[PDB]
């Protein structure tokens, strides 16, 4: 414990920012969901994931986030994100 840095490398399109995170144990999903819209300029979102059946899959959640944090350790504490509006 705990665990340590993540790098949440966020798409937006044609767009992309790496989100450094200190303390990932430390945040919830609002915080994250809240720092994309900020930076992308959006207001209704869904963000997806790639798990390690390399499939995109849904954060919805606190829940959901914190079992994508999970395996972003197992993968060199970094998650590819993809966002969309709507
Ligand atoms: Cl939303």
Known sequence: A???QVTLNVTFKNEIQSFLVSDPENTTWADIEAMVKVSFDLNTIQIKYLDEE???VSINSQGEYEEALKMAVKQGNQLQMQVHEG
Do not use: A, D, L, R
């Open 54 to 56: 390399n499939e995109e």
């Open 2 to 4: 705990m665990e340590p």
